C-alpha cells in the first residue's frame, strides 16, 4: 500500500482523535464563561464535526479564548485531513492515467 494511501488513512484516524479531544477540551475551556453553550460533551462533539467540516451554525461557537484556540485546531485538522484525502485521490488518478498511456 502506497504512502499517500496511508497518510490519508492516518489523517482520518487523527481527525477522529482531534474531534473527541476537541469536544472534551472545548467543554473545559467553556464552562466558567457566562452565556457559553459549548458546555456538555455531546453538543460539543457535534459542534466539533461541524467545525472540522468548516460548517457554522448560529452562535454555536466557543466564546472563550482557549475555546477558540481549540476551534482552530479542529478546523485545521479537518481541512488538512480532507485535502489530504483529496491529494491521495489525485495520486491514484495520476498513476492510473500513466498506466493507461503505457508510460
Amino acid at each position: 500500500s502506497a504512502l499517500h494511501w496511508r497518510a490519508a488513512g492516518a489523517a482520518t484516524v487523527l481527525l477522529v482523535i482531534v474531534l473527541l479531544a476537541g469536544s472534551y477540551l472545548a467543554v473545559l475551556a467553556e464552562r466558567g464563561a457566562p452565556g457559553a453553550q459549548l458546555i456538555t460533551y455531546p453538543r460539543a462533539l457535534w459542534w466539533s464535526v461541524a467545525t472540522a467540516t468548516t460548517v457554522g451554525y448560529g452562535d454555536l461557537y466557543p466564546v472563550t479564548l482557549w475555546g477558540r484556540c481549540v476551534a482552530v485546531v479542529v478546523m485545521v485538522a479537518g481541512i488538512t485531513s480532507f485535502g489530504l484525502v483529496t491529494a491521495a485521490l489525485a495520486t491514484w488518478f495520476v498513476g492510473r492515467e500513466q498506466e493507461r498511456r503505457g508510460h
Partner: antibody
Amino acid sequence: QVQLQQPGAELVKPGASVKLSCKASGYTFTSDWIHWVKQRPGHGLEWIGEIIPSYGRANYNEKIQKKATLTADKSSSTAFMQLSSLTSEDSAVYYCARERGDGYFAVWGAGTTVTVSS
Amino acid sequence: DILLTQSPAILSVSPGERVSFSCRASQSIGTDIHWYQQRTNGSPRLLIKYASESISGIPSRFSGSGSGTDFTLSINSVESEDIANYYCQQSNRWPFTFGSGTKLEIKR
C-alpha cells in the same frame, strides 16, 4: 448502592470556615463533574459551583458572593468545598451531585446540614 | 443567566387526577431542561432528563413535554407518594440554574 457520601452535619462559628466532603463510588470517569448546591430551609435549589476532579479546574456562581473554594482528591475519589467567613446567611443543607458532562445531576448526596452559630 | 419560572408555586389536585407543572425559560433552550423531585427531608431525585426522556426507576405516571421556552412535567393518576417539590434545571447555557419550584398538594 449509595454513590455519594456527605457528613450529615457540620457546626461552624460565625466568622470561621469549614471544608465539607463528598466521596464517590460506582462508575466514575475522568470526564465527570461534581457540583455543589445550597438549600436554605424552606427555599429552593441554588447552584454554588462545579469541579472536575481529574484536572482540578472549578467554576463558581458569580451572582452570589464567593464563600467557597472547590478542590478534589483523585486517589480517594473525594471532593471538597471550602466555605469561609460564614454568617447566618450561610446556614443550610449543601448537596453535592454528579454530572457526567451531559447537563443533569444523575445522583445526589444526602447533603450536609451546616449551622453557623456561637 | 437563563431564568426559569415555575408558576404556580403550589398546585392542589384531587387523588387520581392528572397534574401539570410548568417551567418557562427567559429564552429558548431547545430541550435542555430536566426535572427533579424532592420529598420532605429527602434530596433531589432526577425524574426526567432533556424535557421528555424517561429515567429508569421512575413510575410511568411521569412524563415531560416542551421545547424552546415552555415545558411541562406531567403526572397521571396522582398519588400520595407524589407529594413533594418539583424543580426544573437547564443546561443550555452556563451557568446551570433551577426554577423556584412547585409544591404538589393532594386534596383527600
